[PDB]
Symmetry: C4
């Protein structure tokens, strides 16, 4: 059968200069494998194609510490694989980056309703290896609160049409709504605690 | 006695251009140190010899999430040393890379029989330091389900014949069958649970 | 609303050659998010602007081991993010680096009073990516015991004045005193233990 | 008072071409901070001075797995800081690298007596940043069983003679014998278990 990567390492994927297919326009928050997950899509740089890369995510926001101190712009770490090595990417085709929301996540108590008033910026940083030269580069993007879609899911972009594993970039930025619990992960766990008889 | 590495760092190993001795042709699944382990062999690049390198492994496959979503090509992390630093290689001679299958592994429930119908691709990525220039490079390979041999074991390639630690590459790709439990690790643990009186 | 980072990765921050705005002149020890934290500020290099960087911290001091051995200069690790990935910085504007003091920290039993007699040197090492060339560099600094201010807090340097997220470097090195517990973290935990009825 | 590192990052340390002061000639196994520790000293490269560097250690040896398989040359990971970040070195002067022997260490059951018959090779790999160019390099060394000294301790090499933090390399390779328990760490823990009344 057709394989994505040949024995010698050659990738069998069938994919303008304006770098707009690097990161998806929006991020989404919906269920995946039983967990509410923050997701965004990464593709590649049109003028500097990469195969390998490392990705990191920071949550930027203003906040008042319990001590009463106002932090104009604080950065909070958003785990996107440092605890598995999943942050070391293999860019054979687009990838849906996942941030599983839990008690360690800054988004632990982010619910659909709190989204209305919340104000933040999810910054994504990808430092990849340009295949052609071998040197390193970096691409960044950002998702403000209005660019994070609760209850949405990314359309798939990979298929097989005649021995060719194809990537449909016309669906790169496309998302669709799905029935998703409005509760924050903290609330879900709070409800789990109160569910015990 | 003869040493593999001199005090000054010189390696004492006695080893065409077609890069075919970089990764073993097949991967195997058999017992090592009491654990069912996924293994494959890494050697080196004939046109760009490396001494240092980092290795990572991704499991590529199609799957349907519990939510009913079909993921055409999902990548699952296969731990090959990130939790020990064992993924930072010292390429003095061929190395048998080990993925110890456990509850954290995507192969946790992979048994000999399920292999027949299963469909996947184990992609290996090695980014090493070319000794001659000092610059970095990358080599990749892949193992589809039909290239993963259950119950097989790699032949040893290192020996000492007259003060020379020799590498026999004619046995680089060679494997042999050994009595191996057909059960998946999950099943083994399931059987351990039911064994308690 | 105004965003810190555009969709294409461009940062929207409004900032002599003498490199003096790279690290704050002093470090401080005060409460943040309910934890006594060692903090210092990092900005950037005026002659080689960086956006990405990794930071590490070492505690240098003389000490006598329980075995009676005197170590003229021993280096102790000061966790500044290796256990979260928070040590991989996004230098969009100044950042207050935090070392949360706990049982794993060399400063676990450092109190305001012990500061008087204590003798040490907190060395900070930042290896960043110069935006202009793409190559790597390193900057270092040090904080002796007399440059660590107990009970002090850094003044904020970020604001928004007419669609511009501004950085006021005139306050880069500025700190102010705040009511802070004089106890070491070990002592705080010792007092917590004795508080149990 | 005199400081090791100036505020601007300049190190205040007062230190032929043959690279022989990079790694100590021998490694030692003795008590430090209540733990039996494997130690060796690292200094620097005379022809390519480094300030920053990462260090890793591999245990090379032949062994027979519980399955009866003979591994001619197996590599076992020797933790030298990957679980703290202590492996990311600051080479301001010589450093005594420490491997704290515990249940996770390949040397867990290595005792003074077993040393007589044991056969192995502790390979050390240091990849550092040459201060002058900014490019990366690597240095390696090895310690066979006969080069690992049980019950020995390294002489200190740092001192202060007239505002100068001096490094005496004439003592770089020097070690001295100290009363050290002959037991392996496993044995020590075995004795701790049997000590419970």
């Amino acid at each position: 059968r057709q394989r994505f990567v040949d024995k010698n390492g050659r990738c069998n994927v069938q994919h303008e200069r304006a770098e707009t297919l690097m990161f998806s326009e929006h991020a989404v928050i919906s269920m995946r494998d039983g967990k509410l997950t923050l997701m965004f899509r990464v593709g590649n740089l049109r003028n500097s194609h990469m195969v390998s890369a490392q990705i990191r995510c920071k949550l930027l926001k203003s906040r008042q510490t319990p001590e009463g101190e106002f932090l104009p712009l604080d950065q909070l770490e958003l785990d996107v694989g440092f605890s598995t090595g999943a942050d070391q990417l293999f860019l054979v085709s687009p990838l849906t980056i996942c941030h599983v929301i839990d008690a360690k996540s800054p988004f632990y108590d982010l619910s659909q309703r709190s989204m209305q008033t919340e104000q933040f910026e999810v910054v994504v940083i990808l430092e990849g290896i340009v295949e052609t030269t071998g040197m390193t580069c970096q691409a960044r993007t950002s998702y403000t609160e209005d660019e994070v879609l609760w209850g949405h899911r990314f359309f798939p972009v990979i298929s097989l049409e005649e021995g060719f594993f194809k990537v449909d970039y016309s669906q790169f930025h496309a998302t669709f709504e799905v029935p998703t619990p409005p509760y924050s992960v903290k609330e879900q766990e709070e409800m789990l605690l109160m569910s015990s008889p």
